[PDB]
């Protein structure tokens, strides 16, 4: 209620069916835990390593298959001045497993309906974190190494100030445009 | 209510079943109590040793299987004025095993979505002292033997106010920023 | 109500199921009542010896189990002025055994969500004086005893004061800060 | 009412289910009433001379076994100014014994959490008399015995008035803080 | 309501069942009236020959042994202004004997939780005479004759009125305070 | 109404159930006429004979035994300006005999509690007449004939108002103080 925000089989919006019920089968637990490989591991100019979503939808794909999971409304989507955020469940062979908060920016009205989306794909990269998937993300020594040998710091010109900000950029990705 | 702040098969949203039930199986009891490893355990710059989360996951992974765990709300998000906090329960192999309420705290309103999945790792965190995992962490002579041969302690300059506080790192990490 | 605080398959959460019913099979006996190692058992700087509360759930494990044992609330946790308590009972193998009234001090506003755990803890530490664990902690024989063998008493600066107090202390820990 | 207090399968709480029913069987019957040894018996400095209430845990545990006995609550918590009181009942291998009640002294707000346990203990104390144990501790003639061969009388100097007060005290053990 | 004072399988709080149903087995009436023995049986300075409640509970526990007997309240706990009562009723094997109102006296507030057990005691005390247990401290035979060998009449100063009173004490017992 | 006093399987409390149903066997009636030994038979100072209630309870245990018979309450203690009543039954092998209404006189407020147990055995007392027990002391013969061998009458100083009464005492017994 303190946000500064309004509202905009198996009944999976309230239902706890299956959670933490059974484990899965092998080949599944092996392939959830492949360790990811560098190149495709993005970074944020201010510092921070993620991996896309669509990375994380190949690797349920995979692991799963198509069909065999899937994302669940937990909560009316809630609108705040300046972002958007939904609960979202993960549902992987008719069970679930676990609910996240999923957040997006926006910055304008006609993007709301743009963002509604995103906030949903934030959400399965928190739930994934569940299944182990993209763990070394979270790991300092992972991200530290990742720093200081896949990436560097460069000074950029933010464009809309026109200021010098010291920024990370992979060694062989380019600028793009938050900045120059 | 003192609190200044405002709510934001099985019923696992108030169910007890199959608390302190039945034990697990031999394996599990073994690879729960696994010794932690030195390298992977952090510290605050204040002299607070901890584990990541992304590691209490792992284990649980590793010990239970993706699937076979679990974590559910068990009552509304509260959110004070400068934290937000929720009540988890941990859910093993269709048994309840614990309930805790984890924190998180967040500085400006767009982070409030942002803090209120972070207090679930640290409800995950707790509960797991349930479960005997990364007990050393609160052993007091785990705690000063890891301090006394894994860490130093030197000054640093908080650059918010330009001051020189004496903080305590790892032998091999760096100083990372509320500090230089 | 004369507290100067306010509220914050079997219901465990008001069932009595199990009471005193029957006792446990004979290595839980024998475990139960493992004599206290000397070495990890700590004290208050003004002479009131303890044991970690870790210890109690490593022994806890040890007796019954991961996944055997479990805590449940009895009550509305009720946070006083300058405390908060709650009352938790112990639920052993399907069976309960005692409920306790934990507390915690806490001494500021965003320390009731860090404190409300404690008292959890606390209230375990209670229970399982039903258990026989840790008797020799209440034992005057061995108190005395181990003070004068295995502690020492020594003056220390009180830094918000700058007194002098006489305190207690193991022969090998050092000094920690409430004090110097 | 006139006490100057407010209120802080079977169910216990208000069932009678048991009481005097069958007596226990033979070796319960012989450990039950087992003679309390001398050395273990303390003495207030008033004069008054009582067993240690851990003592009596550990007794009903090699009686009836862990998880064979327990206390239940059987009324409110009535908390007078100067102290709180409740009311206990002790169930022994599903069959309820006693009924008693529990006393114990508060000198502080912040104690009722810690007092409130205190009691439960006298309760058991107390309850312990219907069977037996401990018996010897309420026999004048015991009493006067252990007084004149076990116990000597001292003068102390009181430290919160600097008065000189002749109180009671074992042969081996050493003046604790009401006094000096 | 004359009375200057206050209320504080089988429902045995108000169920008659099985009183005066069967008589008991042989051993148990022949140990039921056990002739007592005499070094045990105190008195009052006033003149008026007792024994000692716990020696009740012995006999007790060595007729129907433990666990074969009990107490049960018969109504609410009336407290007077300089007393407390309560009636209660004798259990032994499953069957109902007696009823009797147990009375205490307490000279301060503090004071009742502490007495409201002792008339507990008293009722028990009263309601053995239905069992014939202690029958000769009732005959006036056995009064006379003890009071005139085993007990002697001397003057002793009470304290609080520095008066000189003729009180009887056993001749190897010592004078207690209420007195000198 | 005009007393000038105030209320203070088979429900026993109203149920008449075997009253005067069949007899009993053989060995019971030849008990319960035991003739009555002289020895134990006091009498009052003011000339009335009559034996003590402990040998009416010993009488009725050596016939039903122990277990065998009991009293119940039959309607509402009445207190009286100076004196207590109550209404009890005899019940024997499951068989009610018959009700009476027994008194006790008391002199102060203290004193009900004490008494009101005290009329209860005047009505045992009183209800063993339809036993045939004690049926001696209300023969006119037996009273005078007693009197006249096994009594004497002698004046004695009655120590309140400093009067010299003729009073009735037994031969070997000696004056005891409502007198000298």
Redesign the interface.
Known sequence: ????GTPLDIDWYTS?????????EAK??KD??EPLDPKDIEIKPDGLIYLPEIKYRRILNKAFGAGGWGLVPRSQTIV?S??V?REYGLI??G???????G?Q?YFNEAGIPTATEGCKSNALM?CC????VG?EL????FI?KFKVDHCTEKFVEHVTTKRKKKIWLRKDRQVEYPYK
Do not use: N
């Not at 706890?16 to 899965?24: D, E, I, N, Q």
């Not at 974190?129 to 182990?132: E, H, Q, T, V, Y």
């Open positions: 209620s303190k946000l500064g706890w069916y299956g959670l933490g019920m059974k484990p899965f599944v637990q959830l835990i705040t300046k972002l955020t992987c062979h069970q679930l497993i676990s609910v996240a908060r957040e920016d928190r974190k569940d299944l182990g763990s979270w790991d300092p020594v530290k």
